[PDB]
RNA sequence: GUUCUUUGUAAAGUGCCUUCGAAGAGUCGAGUUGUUUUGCAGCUCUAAGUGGGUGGUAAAUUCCAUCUAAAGCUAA
RNA sequence: GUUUGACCUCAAAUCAGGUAGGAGUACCCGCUGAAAAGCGGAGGAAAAGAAACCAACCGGGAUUGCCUUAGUAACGGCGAGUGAAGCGGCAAAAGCUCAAAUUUGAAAUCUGGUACCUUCGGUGCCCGAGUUGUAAUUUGGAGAGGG
């Protein structure tokens, strides 16, 4: 037959995350890979392959 | 006599020079020639006499005289009740072993088990550990080089027995070898069940040397650090020492309050002991200063007559706190006003204060006078990675300090709102710490 | 045609049969004005396009090419978050202040845990109608998820009242009928 | 009495057909599908308790050669 | 010829279960609901005891120790639902 | 990530939601052809652990087979149909009393993403022509039974091989 | 071998400390049928996570060993 | 708003670019199969191949092939006869890649078109593909974050 769903496990709420994963450095500082792409464009403009 | 007079290896000499030690305390000056002689010992000494270093020197002498590989053995084994005392003994022992060649480690219930497991798989030539986690590591970790046991020490068997780890200790000693093992143990007082473990441990016949209102402030767990900050600003230009539990929270609160630019001295086991001595000297001579310290680093040294004793964290030994405030009052003719922070789960401690029969004064809190820096705290933690990690470390070591606490009737982790604790540390979401709850 | 015949015969065979209650939480979804204000919120937090990204890159790169190293200062980018594993990744920290969930995904099973997962994690989820409308606010074709974590101080008060609005309109209205087996009525 | 016949995972076909013949012999015996562990044996008691048998029989085949 | 102790290599599968995977499995449990023989199985516990329940579950399964875990799991479900 | 949710939910097949989706989709696929192109993997996690990537050069076919194995024959059908494609792998999705359904990942060695990107350029080798025709796929190696273990002995084709060992005689220049 | 250039807070490696530390399900397996001499295939049923596979071992409410299946490539 | 548009699906293209077939087939790999034939699929080799291995030792260490094990074990109207494998010696030696937790301070990825250029390609621009996940990093022998 059919019957409504039991929510035994949802009703207890986790006050904490699952994983104790340490926070990375790059989440706090300006993005590095952005800056590498910036310096790529800088090298292309120094070679004049990209016009300002 | 002196430490530098006695026969020692030169890196141990460099170590003792850099720890600032020249002279000997008298009971340790007594026990050191039997410590070199190779006899078992028990000993009555005050907590913090330097009695860690007392065994640390001939243990490293034994490891120097044997010169065995890290794969070869473990040898020196240290049993100590408190996670905080374990970290203090470890932090003293680090530079000592660092000038030496051998290996040093930690086994603590509440640490990451795969970490301690991999360190045991590598092998550790000097183990410092809590009694409860040792049964897990001896029964469960495979391939761990156990058969050597060059020596073994117990510290404060009163505190093991008062926690109640003595049956675990009996199972440990029944796992432990005896013939290669020598046993040395320090305990300020003694009981019969202490002496029963002593009769099992001490392999030769040993020679042994034997030598008021409180403030209480009930606060919610979120606003208590803020209220500490507010009360510390209001009582600026008054020297005050704050008692903590975990050295990480000591270092983090010190770095935080120095980032809020009010002058704060730190005092903890991770602090280098010459720097520790410098900080204590500067606090004692400066006479208007903020001192952040743990419980037992404060226990390890005498205290100047202070404007305030503030105890933020839960105590290591509440009985020693009751004796400590009494000896603080009777020693200091200048009035030292003692307070402890409380959480509304902790009021049973109060009736144990009513078991202590000393008077008690409730110190009230105005909700209007709140420093309101918590948004700046959260913006700071979202900004600074370094402060973010130190905040997480103070939080982690704080919760593991609750885990390592004896009086469950006074402190249950199930009672505590970790959301408010994180907001006190300044996290809007509590970070995950791998803690049995 | 065949495909018109099947796409009309689809949604008949579904409603004719009993759907499990972990489905039909979908289409019990957000009403008109609240979804409208939610979109007004998230269009304030559009992510940067590839063209706008490359344009700012060319600006700062021409600056460094002159050099003319102007300053080193930028607060953070704030935007919606839209990668599905990234959306789940922002939960279980928790970091998701609001989550929008598309009702229509053809592999529905990609999505079905997310209401219960934000339920147990306490995250204020809301089921939105149409993943194309998610893709429009995130410069994709479809997105099927929409997480939002970081908000300026100008918008933070609007955020909290939107959360309370959703928890009133979604969590109170549809919670018991979420447990019930939907459909089953023939066509 | 009720009876139970249990084999291990080890089977040769000539090693197998004997168990068929024995199941043909005793009707109060049963012909349960084979157990996983040749080593753990206490569970079988529970199995006999779940089959209400008064004598249980177990066949261990080591290395497909020894019975 | 005397001894040497190797560092014993234990697979990371054999270490333990994480908090994450227990959360994953238990969160899948209430969402998935019960399969129909599990719907039978909870009722068969409640009606005719764990003896007949384990026997029917072993009949549904192949082996016996899995039937133990299945019956114990449905007992955990009954304990999680009925008292709570 | 969300793939662990999909895997653990995927292990509970006769659970109510999965059999609901299964029962809808079997009729829905019954409307369509024996073989056709699926827009996306219905079980993406299973496709990932079989090696699917979502880029050009990855084609997903859905194939219907009547109840060799059924899976290998299902691979052979789409191998015969899309000859330009190379069959990566396949997996079960759904079944009926009349038919089982499989979802097959094929990879084109003509597309320049596949001809570059050296994680997958090996499949451009002409030794990888029709792996299902030689049973070089996963289900092919299972039905050939090629692993390590004493449980693995001389079986069918290898049996003829060791029949070959009994059939040929080896002689040296100096007789031993 | 010469010769021209390549850096951008670029990429990597080793020791120590600290905090973590997630893996192949209609699969494993069970029964039956065919086929082979134990696998394979079909049909039905169908799991676990200090898990699982496999083998010896017993002075026995045993211990120990040894690998990580259900994804892939690889010259001679 | 009876309007307009996102998608999604499905069609159509004398649209652009590619690719499949057939022959041969000594060797190889699958399928079928009698008293081999046949079918299908490749290459210069193919297959297999980096242990859910073998062992029980003072352990060994991907696969392949040779000598030995050995006409032994085992099987078989235990009749006809069938018929291995571990180890050892040698030849040759080579190891690697995914799939699981976030880059979220910026999809960082790629096909295609076009303009040039030093063209088994490169650069630029623009369409697209792609978050229902393309890159970097990590495959337990750990590894990652930091310091």
UniProtKB/Swiss-Prot annotation, chain A:
This is Ribosome biogenesis protein ERB1. It comes from Saccharomyces cerevisiae (strain YJM789) (Baker's yeast). Component of the NOP7 complex, composed of ERB1, NOP7 and YTM1. The complex is held together by ERB1, which interacts with NOP7 via its N-terminal domain and with YTM1 via a high-affinity interaction between the seven-bladed beta-propeller domains of the 2 proteins. The NOP7 complex associates with the 66S pre-ribosome. The lineage of its organism: Eukaryota, Fungi, Dikarya, Ascomycota, Saccharomycotina. Component of the NOP7 complex, which is required for maturation of the 25S and 5.8S ribosomal RNAs and formation of the 60S ribosome. Belongs to the WD repeat BOP1/ERB1 family. The gene is ERB1. It is found in: Nucleus, Nucleolus; Nucleus, Nucleoplasm.
Curated annotation (Swiss-Prot), chain D:
The keyword Transmembrane does not apply. It comes from Saccharomyces cerevisiae (strain ATCC 204508 / S288c) (Baker's yeast). This is Ribosome biogenesis protein BRX1. One of its GO terms (molecular function) is 5S rRNA binding. Required for biogenesis of the 60S ribosomal subunit. Its main location: nucleus. One of its GO terms (cellular component) is preribosome, large subunit precursor. Part of a complex that includes BRX1, RPF1, RPF2 and SSF1 or SSF2. Keywords: Nucleus, Phosphoprotein, Ribosome biogenesis. It is found in: Nucleus, Nucleolus. GO terms for biological process: endonucleolytic cleavage in ITS1 upstream of 5.8S rRNA from tricistronic rRNA transcript (SSU-rRNA, 5.8S rRNA, LSU-rRNA); exonucleolytic trimming to generate mature 5'-end of 5.8S rRNA from tricistronic rRNA transcript (SSU-rRNA, 5.8S rRNA, LSU-rRNA); ribosomal large subunit assembly.
Swiss-Prot record, chain E:
This is Large ribosomal subunit protein eL36A. The keyword Translocase does not apply. GO terms for cellular component: cytosol; cytosolic large ribosomal subunit. Component of the large ribosomal subunit (LSU). Mature yeast ribosomes consist of a small (40S) and a large (60S) subunit. The 40S small subunit contains 1 molecule of ribosomal RNA (18S rRNA) and 33 different proteins (encoded by 57 genes). The large 60S subunit contains 3 rRNA molecules (25S, 5.8S and 5S rRNA) and 46 different proteins (encoded by 81 genes). GO terms for molecular function: RNA binding; structural constituent of ribosome. The keyword Cytoplasm applies. Keywords: Acetylation, Cytoplasm, Ribonucleoprotein, Ribosomal protein. Belongs to the eukaryotic ribosomal protein eL36 family. The gene is RPL36A. Component of the ribosome, a large ribonucleoprotein complex responsible for the synthesis of proteins in the cell. The small ribosomal subunit (SSU) binds messenger RNAs (mRNAs) and translates the encoded message by selecting cognate aminoacyl-transfer RNA (tRNA) molecules. The large subunit (LSU) contains the ribosomal catalytic site termed the peptidyl transferase center (PTC), which catalyzes the formation of peptide bonds, thereby polymerizing the amino acids delivered by tRNAs into a polypeptide chain. It is found in: Cytoplasm. Signal peptide: none annotated. N-terminally acetylated by acetyltransferase NatA. One of its GO terms (biological process) is cytoplasmic translation.
Curated annotation (Swiss-Prot), chain F:
PROSITE patterns: RIBOSOMAL_L15E. SMART domains: Ribosomal_L15e. Its main location: cytoplasm. GO terms for cellular component: cytosol; cytosolic large ribosomal subunit. It is found in: Cytoplasm. Residues 136-157 are annotated as: Disordered. Gene3D superfamilies: Ribosomal protein l15e. Residues 141-157 have a biased composition (Basic residues). Keywords: Cytoplasm, Ribonucleoprotein, Ribosomal protein. GO terms for biological process: cytoplasmic translation. Component of the large ribosomal subunit (LSU). Mature yeast ribosomes consist of a small (40S) and a large (60S) subunit. The 40S small subunit contains 1 molecule of ribosomal RNA (18S rRNA) and 33 different proteins (encoded by 57 genes). The large 60S subunit contains 3 rRNA molecules (25S, 5.8S and 5S rRNA) and 46 different proteins (encoded by 81 genes). Component of the ribosome, a large ribonucleoprotein complex responsible for the synthesis of proteins in the cell. The small ribosomal subunit (SSU) binds messenger RNAs (mRNAs) and translates the encoded message by selecting cognate aminoacyl-transfer RNA (tRNA) molecules. The large subunit (LSU) contains the ribosomal catalytic site termed the peptidyl transferase center (PTC), which catalyzes the formation of peptide bonds, thereby polymerizing the amino acids delivered by tRNAs into a polypeptide chain. This is Large ribosomal subunit protein eL15A. It comes from Saccharomyces cerevisiae (strain ATCC 204508 / S288c) (Baker's yeast). The lineage of its organism: Eukaryota, Fungi, Dikarya, Ascomycota, Saccharomycotina.
């Amino acid at each position: 037959p059919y019957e409504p769903l039991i929510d035994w496990f949802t009703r207890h709420e986790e006050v904490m995350p699952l994983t104790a994963v340490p926070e990375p450095k790059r989440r706090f500082v300006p993005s590095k890979n952005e800056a590498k792409r910036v310096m790529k464009i800088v090298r292309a403009i120094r070679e004049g392959r990209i016009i300002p | 006599e002196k430490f530098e007079e006695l026969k020692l290896s030169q890196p141990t000499l460099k170590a003792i020079e850099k720890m600032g030690f020249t002279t000997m305390t008298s009971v340790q000056a007594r026990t050191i020639p039997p410590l070199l002689a190779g006899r078992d010992v028990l000993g009555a000494a005050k907590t913090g006499s330097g009695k860690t270093l007392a065994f640390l020197i001939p243990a490293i002498e034994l490891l120097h005289s044997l010169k065995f590989k890290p794969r070869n053995g473990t040898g020196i084994i240290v049993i100590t009740p408190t996670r905080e005392l374990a970290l203090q003994i470890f932090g003293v022992a680090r530079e000592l072993m660092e000038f030496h060649s051998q290996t040093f480690g930690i086994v603590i219930g509440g640490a990451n088990r795969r970490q301690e497991a991999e360190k045991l798989m590598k092998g550790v030539n000097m183990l410092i550990a809590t009694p409860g986690r040792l049964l897990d590591h001896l029964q469960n970790t495979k391939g761990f080089v156990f058969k050597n046991l060059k020596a073994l020490i117990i510290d404060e068997a009163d505190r093991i027995l008062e926690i109640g780890f003595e049956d675990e200790m009996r199972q440990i000693i029944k796992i432990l070898p005896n013939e290669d093992r020598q046993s040395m143990l320090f305990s300020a007082t003694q009981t019969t069940k202490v002496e029963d473990l002593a009769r099992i441990s001490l392999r030769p016949g040993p020679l042994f040397i034997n030598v008021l209102e409180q403030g209480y402030v009930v606060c919610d767990s979120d606003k208590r650090f803020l209220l500490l900050f507010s009360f510390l600003k209001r009582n600026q230009k008054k020297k005050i020492i704050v008692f903590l539990s975990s050295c990480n929270s000591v270092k983090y609160y010190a770095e935080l309050l120095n980032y809020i630019d009010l002058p704060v001295l730190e005092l903890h086991g991770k602090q280098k002991q010459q720097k520790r001595t410098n900080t204590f000297f500067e606090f004692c001579n400066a006479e208007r200063g903020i001192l952040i310290c743990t419980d037992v680093a404060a226990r390890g040294l005498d205290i100047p007559a202070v404007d305030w004793i503030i105890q933020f964290d839960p105590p290591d030994d509440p009985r020693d706190y009751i004796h400590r405030v009494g000896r603080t009052a009777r020693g200091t003719k200048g009035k030292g006003k003692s307070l402890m922070f409380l959480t509304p789960n902790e009021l049973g401690f109060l009736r144990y204060l009513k078991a202590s029969k000393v008077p008690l004064n409730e110190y009230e809190f105005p909700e209007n006078k709140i420093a309101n820096v918590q948004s700046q705290l959260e913006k700071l933690i979202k900004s600074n990675y370094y402060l973010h990690q130190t905040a997480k470390d103070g939080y982690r070591s704080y919760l593991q300090a609750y885990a390592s606490h004896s009086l469950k009737t006074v402190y249950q982790i199930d009672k505590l709102d970790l959301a408010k604790v994180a907001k006190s540390y300044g996290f809007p979401v509590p970070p995950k710490v791998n803690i049995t709850i | 045609p065949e495909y018109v015949r099947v796409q009309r015969q689809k949604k008949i065979l579904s409603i004719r049969l009993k759907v499990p209650p972990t489905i039909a939480q979908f289409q019990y979804t957000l009403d008109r004005n609240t979804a409208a204000e939610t979109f007004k919120l998230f269009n304030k937090y559009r992510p940067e396009t590839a063209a706008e990204k490359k344009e700012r890159l060319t600006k700062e790169a021409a600056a460094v090419a002159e050099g003319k190293s102007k300053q080193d200062a930028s607060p953070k980018p704030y935007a919606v978050k839209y990668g599905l594993n990234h959306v789940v990744a922002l939960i279980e920290n928790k970091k998701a202040k609001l989550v929008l969930i598309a009702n229509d995904v053809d592999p529905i099973e990609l999505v079905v845990f997310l209401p219960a997962l934000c339920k147990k994690m306490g995250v204020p989820y809301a089921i939105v109608k149409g993943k194309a409308r998610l893709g429009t606010l995130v410069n994709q074709k479809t997105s099927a998820v929409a997480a939002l974590t970081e908000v300026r101080a100008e918008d933070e008060a609007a955020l909290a009242k939107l959360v309370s609005t959703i928890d009133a309109n979604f969590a109170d209205k549809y919670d018991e009928v979420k447990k019930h087996w939907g459909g089953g009525i023939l066509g | 009495q009720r009876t139970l016949l249990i084999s291990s995972r080890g089977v040769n076909y000539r090693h197998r057909h004997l168990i068929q013949d024995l199941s043909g012999l005793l009707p109060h015996s049963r012909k349960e599908p084979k157990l996983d562990t040749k080593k753990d044996l206490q569970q079988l008691n529970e199995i006999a308790e779940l089959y209400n048998c008064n004598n249980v029989l177990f066949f261990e085949a080591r290395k497909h050669q020894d019975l | 010829v005397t001894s040497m102790t190797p560092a014993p290599k234990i697979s990371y599968k054999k270490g333990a279960a994480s908090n994450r995977t227990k959360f994953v499995r238990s969160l899948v449990r209430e969402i998935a609901g019960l399969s129909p023989y599990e719907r039978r199985l909870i009722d068969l516990i409640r009606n005719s005891g764990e003896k007949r329940a384990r026997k029917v579950a072993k009949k549904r399964l192949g082996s016996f120790t899995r039937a133990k875990a299945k019956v114990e799991e449905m007992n955990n479900i009954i304990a999680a639902s009925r008292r709570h | 990530g969300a793939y662990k949710y999909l895997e653990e939910l995927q292990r509970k097949k006769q659970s109510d939601v999965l059999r609901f989706l299964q029962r809808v989709r079997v009729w829905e696929y019954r409307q369509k052809n024996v073989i056709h192109r699926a827009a996306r993997p219905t079980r993406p996690d299973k496709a990932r652990r079989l090696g699917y990537k979502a880029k050009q050069g990855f084609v997903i076919y859905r194939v219907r087979v009547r109840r060799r194995s059924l899976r290998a024959t299902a691979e052979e059908r789409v191998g015969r149909r899309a000859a330009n494609l190379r069959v990566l792998n396949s997996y079960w999705v759904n079944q009926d009393s009349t038919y089982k359904y499989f979802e097959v990942i094929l990879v084109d060695p003509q597309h320049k993403a596949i001809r570059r990107d050296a994680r997958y350029n090996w499949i451009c080798d002409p030794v990888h022509k029709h792996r299902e025709a030689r049973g070089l796929t996963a289900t092919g190696k299972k039905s050939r039974g090629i692993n390590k273990g004493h449980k693995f002995n001389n079986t069918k084709a290898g049996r003829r091989k060791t029949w070959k060992r009994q059939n040929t005689l080896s002689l040296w220049r100096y007789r031993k």
